[PDB]
Amino acid sequence: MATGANATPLDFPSKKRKRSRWNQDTMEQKTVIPGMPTVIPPGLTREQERAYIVQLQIEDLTRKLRTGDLGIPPNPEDRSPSPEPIYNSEGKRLNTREFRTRKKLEEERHNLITEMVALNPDFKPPADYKPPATRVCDKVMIPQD
């Protein structure tokens, strides 16, 4: 050595084997395999890109409501307790938790549905997804001139 030494701080590369950040199957045993590429092809639009991304998320979201594939909770450590923005008159005593999770899932999907339908008018939403408003009466009436 000539004069002084600088050396390097002692730190070995961590975060290699502890928490998987590239899983695929949660809530159950790995057997249900999603088969669809995510990479986007060269020659599209920003709207269509989302539609392609969201369609995959829509099916995977629906997969989640279909089998109950949640995996990890949305909020592990809950924040300050806060009520709902939506006004609800009354709920069921037998049905509330189940529905809260499943409906929330439908809303995630719906969020994408509304987006994808806006991005692509020709988009066909999943069969289980129903258009809002139950409507009254039977069939349509006839306007006279």
Binding site: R21, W22, N23, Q24, G35, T38, V39, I40, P42, G71
Partner: protein, 104 residues
């Protein structure tokens, strides 16, 4: 007609996560060590809205790769996985846009 130079990482980062010092260091570090398994990664650009400074656009991050060779063998193995509970949509990005953070 798709490989450019840098890798793209979408659908795996939320603005409510890229705001904490713990979550940030967790993503940048992990994503780095992982990206450095298929080849060489120059750096990583992940937005960090300051108290909501860069929220309008936050949600998409990526890493500056050295060669499209490893960039291809990397994204080909990152597609279909899951950052936590959502399928990661990986893609390709231009080094130019990366530099300007144009996000294209």
């Amino acid at each position: 007609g798709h490989p450019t130079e840098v890798l793209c990482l979408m659908n795996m980062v939320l603005p409510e996560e890229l705001l904490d010092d713990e979550e940030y260091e967790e993503i940048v570090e992990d994503v780095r060590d992982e990206c450095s398994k298929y080849g060489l990664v120059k750096s990583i650009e992940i937005p960090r809205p300051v108290d909501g400074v860069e929220v309008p656009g936050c949600g998409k991050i990526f890493v500056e790769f050295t060669s499209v060779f490893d960039c291809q063998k990397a994204m080909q193995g990152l597609t279909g996985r899951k950052f936590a509970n959502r399928v990661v949509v990986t893609k390709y990005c231009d080094p130019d846009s990366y530099h300007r953070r144009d996000f294209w």
